[PDB]
């Protein structure tokens, strides 16, 4: 499986700061076997894509589930393709838990994006009260099942990267270990093996979307079922390059 | 009060179709006393603003309530200003009722946008069961109060245009007359007079956001408390020009 590192800029960006990050990526020495993605705010998607080498993927941080219509404030996969972008992050914990997106909506969006030629980082993960009730797997599997049920063709799994987010470690004073990450990633892969196929399970990338830093990235990357990262705050800093090189 | 016509493109747009609409607007004969605004999808905001003369306002279809942070998929007023856009639509019925935005969230966004130098089209309106139960004023006033309570000073109303959306007439087989529109607009203006000030009530624009067509726009515009329109589907068509000229 090809190592995969995505930088989620979240709601951070400006022409001036974007240019600084683009220059950092342009001059960086990165393992050529690593897939690298950045996700700027939607206003900046066309310009960042124009300015950045195709070696780097440029992803939207959200999209909707039809090509056009009466959905004020939403953008469609067709629009992403129109400005040269073929990736999107869907189901991020901030969109599920702050902006109230349901499991079914995430699955509908994932099917539609892939049908339009946009690859998907599909995010899953459990909250602290769910983890404490022993429902880590029950929650993650329910989120995955909502994606699976909504896909329209078996090949769509070739266009998905799964990101596990330990939401229970965000603003709770709890911290996740690399062993805890590996245990969830392995459980998710075995769900793929049982519910989809062993062939998809062996080839799909499952990336870790908790706190990823220059200090912890190598111990996370060496875990056998952790295939890369969806990076938060460190994607805005020179540390992102060290994280891209965590597998080498 | 200066007549105000906004075109909400909703989730419609592409480089090619945007160029056609921009060429239509650039060469159109429009009443010079009308304020005209267009609101493209967020991906296209920088390009549409660059290509359209400053005579036209260019608005985002949504934004968030702080300048930056961990809000994947959201954009801030500072980003809008960074690409030259100084207007936003907030509280549109599609965002309230499909994407689940609360009264309080709309008020928080409105205050923050104005504090950052972005003017706001603030949308209100009641659904069919609410109107049939006699709650038109109760609902509209509740939505207005959530904005009022969250503003930092009464002077911020000078950066607001109120749009009344008869959501009860959107896709229900019910239709609104110009008399029904005038009745609600008058009730909203009298709320402004009592809860804010007569000076603001007499100067704030209250625009109609129901079905607006080339055929009905002149009869709506002549109502004394209807100050313009927030146009939907007709904003993508040459009919938009006739609607911009409804007051002349």
Author numbering:
A (entry chain B), B (entry chain A): 5 to 252
Reproduce passages from the article:
Triosephosphate isomerase (TIM, EC 5.3.1.1) is a key enzyme in glycolysis and catalyzes the reversible isomerization between dihydroxyacetone phosphate (DHAP) and glyceraldehyde 3-phosphate (GAP). The overall structure of OvTIM is similar to that of other known TIMs in that it contains 12 α-helices, three 310-helices, and eight parallel β-sheets, forming a classical α/β barrel fold. In OvTIM, a specific SAD motif (S157–D159) is located between α7 and β6, inducing the formation of a subsequent 310-helix γ2 (D159–I164), although the corresponding region is not conserved in either vertebrate TIMs.
We constructed four variants, including a SAD deletion variant (ΔSAD), variant in which the SAD region was substituted with AAA (AAA), variant in which N115 was replaced with Ala (N115A), and double variant (N115A_ΔSAD). First, the thermal shift of the melting curve of the AAA variant was negligible, indicating that the side chains of the SAD motif that protrude into the solvent region do not contribute to protein stability. In the ΔSAD variant, the corresponding region (K153–W158) was not defined except for the molecule of the region which is stabilized via an interaction with other symmetry molecules, while the AAA variant showed a similar structure as the wild-type. The side chain of the SAD motif protruded into the solvent region and no significant Tm change was observed in the AAA variant, indicating that local structural alterations and the stability of OvTIM are related to the number of amino acids of the SAD motif and not the exact sequence of the SAD motif. In contrast to the sequence-independent contribution of the SAD motif to the surface structure change and stability, the side chains of the SAD motif, which are exposed to the solvent region, are still open to participate in the host-parasite interaction.
